[PDB]
């Protein structure tokens, strides 16, 4: 087997999905090369879990998954096992015993708009918490107690999705970031992805 995996496709994609609609891709049956990813200095964050970043090329993976989306800069560390918060509880949660790597690089030149982005959405005021690795795209009006609503907005009846205000002049804290957190099965099944070797 010898192929070049589409890490370029996921990393060099023009448009990433919103956090609430975090895009997921499945990669298998390929020879990956994490050395290029690891050695690049562009990445602001490269924290890994369960697998040291150095020896990725020495592991054979059953099947790999790539989850890509955007985040409002400063709270990038919020995406991690155990760590709690708004988006982690409502949008994207990782399992406590998660195995994989988390990537993040400033993408102000790729996401922010001069007037205002107003095109990346994150959910607020979800009824209950969010289990690890589960999508949530429902756009039903949230009733904050009291009388219920029927397709109406008003007091205690806020919309569930809120848009970001990414702009070039926002400060590193409020600048867009792109996270392409990966996930390795390590199921000990017939390997499909493995690093370069003879």
């Amino acid at each position: 087997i010898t192929n070049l995996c589409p890490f370029g496709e996921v990393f060099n994609a023009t448009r990433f999905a919103s956090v609430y609609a975090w895009n997921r891709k499945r990669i298998s049956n390929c020879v990956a090369d994490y050395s290029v990813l690891y050695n690049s200095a562009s990445f602001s964050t490269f924290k890994c879990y369960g697998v040291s970043p150095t020896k990725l090329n020495d592991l054979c993976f059953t099947n790999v998954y790539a989850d890509s989306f955007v985040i409002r800069g400063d709270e990038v560390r919020q995406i991690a096992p155990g760590q709690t918060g708004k988006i982690a509880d409502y949008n994207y949660k990782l399992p406590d015993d998660f195995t994989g790597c988390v990537i993040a690089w400033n993408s102000n030149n790729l996401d922010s708009k001069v007037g205002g982005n107003y095109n990346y959405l994150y959910r607020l005021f979800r009824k209950s918490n969010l289990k690890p690795f589960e999508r949530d795209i429902s756009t039903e009006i949230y009733q904050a107690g009291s009388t219920p609503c029927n397709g109406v907005e008003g007091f205690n009846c806020y919309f569930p999705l809120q848009s970001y205000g990414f702009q070039p002049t926002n400060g590193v804290g409020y600048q867009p970031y792109r996270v392409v957190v990966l996930s390795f099965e390590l199921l000990h099944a017939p390997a499909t992805v493995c690093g370069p070797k003879k």
Partner: antibody, heavy 120, light 109 residues
């Protein structure tokens, strides 16, 4: 490595329609946006529009909205720009240019252009 | 509507001298600016991206500075191949809107 080979110069009568091609190679054609910019003789660059090669969604400047249609052909990996109702002031060099996304960076390989002459 | 103003319109300088071109933004655009060059006949070639970083393969002579509203494009030492027009280029992301300045030509005395 990236090449934006483009069609040669063309001459058309006023009011006709011109279909300018743009050949791209060395990268995934149906993955990155493509835009067009015309430079008129004695004037600065002016941006034409944008066309996603995958979805087919398009967008144009309001100054000439409705006078153009940029199609595509993913099989041969060539972009097309159709300009109808040509006029004398439309004589300009058109530069098809891809909008490549290097990691947190925009890389812009331009084509050699195409000089279109509107006259009788 | 974002409107850029590149000055001076034209200038001349002997080879090896330091040349500076200013480019003022009507509205704040952070650092969404690039500097492009146009040799006679050839297609535009982006020289500086991000208003600070030099495009891969370009000689180190060129440099870019400034931010917010005003930007500066500087050639440390002029050379014969530098004869060309130079354009500002502001870009927006989702609608890939490009806006260019009036340009400026370099002519060695």
């Amino acid at each position: 490595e990236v090449q934006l080979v483009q069609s040669g110069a063309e001459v058309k009568k006023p009011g006709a329609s011109v279909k300018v091609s743009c050949k791209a190679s060395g990268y995934t054609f149906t993955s990155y946006d493509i835009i067009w910019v015309r430079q008129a003789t004695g004037q600065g660059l002016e941006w034409m529009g944008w066309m996603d090669p995958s979805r087919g969604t398009t967008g144009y400047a309001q100054t000439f909205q409705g006078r153009v249609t940029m199609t595509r052909d993913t099989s041969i990996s060539t972009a097309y720009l159709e300009l109808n109702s040509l006029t004398s002031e439309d004589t300009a060099v058109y530069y098809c240019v891809a909008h490549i996304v290097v990691l947190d960076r925009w890389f812009d390989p331009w084509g050699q252009g195409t000089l279109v002459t509107v006259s009788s | 509507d974002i409107v850029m103003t590149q000055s001076p319109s034209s200038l001349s300088a002997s080879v090896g001298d330091r040349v500076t071109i200013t480019c003022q933004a009507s509205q704040d655009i952070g650092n969404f600016l690039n500097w492009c060059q146009q040799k006679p006949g050839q297609a535009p070639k982006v020289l500086i991206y991000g208003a600070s970083n030099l495009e891969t393969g370009v000689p180190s002579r060129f440099s870019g500075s400034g931010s917010g509203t005003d930007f500066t494009f500087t050639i440390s030492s002029l050379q014969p191949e530098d004869i060309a027009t130079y354009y500002c280029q502001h870009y927006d992301n989702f609608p890939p809107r490009f806006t260019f300045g009036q340009g400026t030509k370099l002519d060695i005395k």
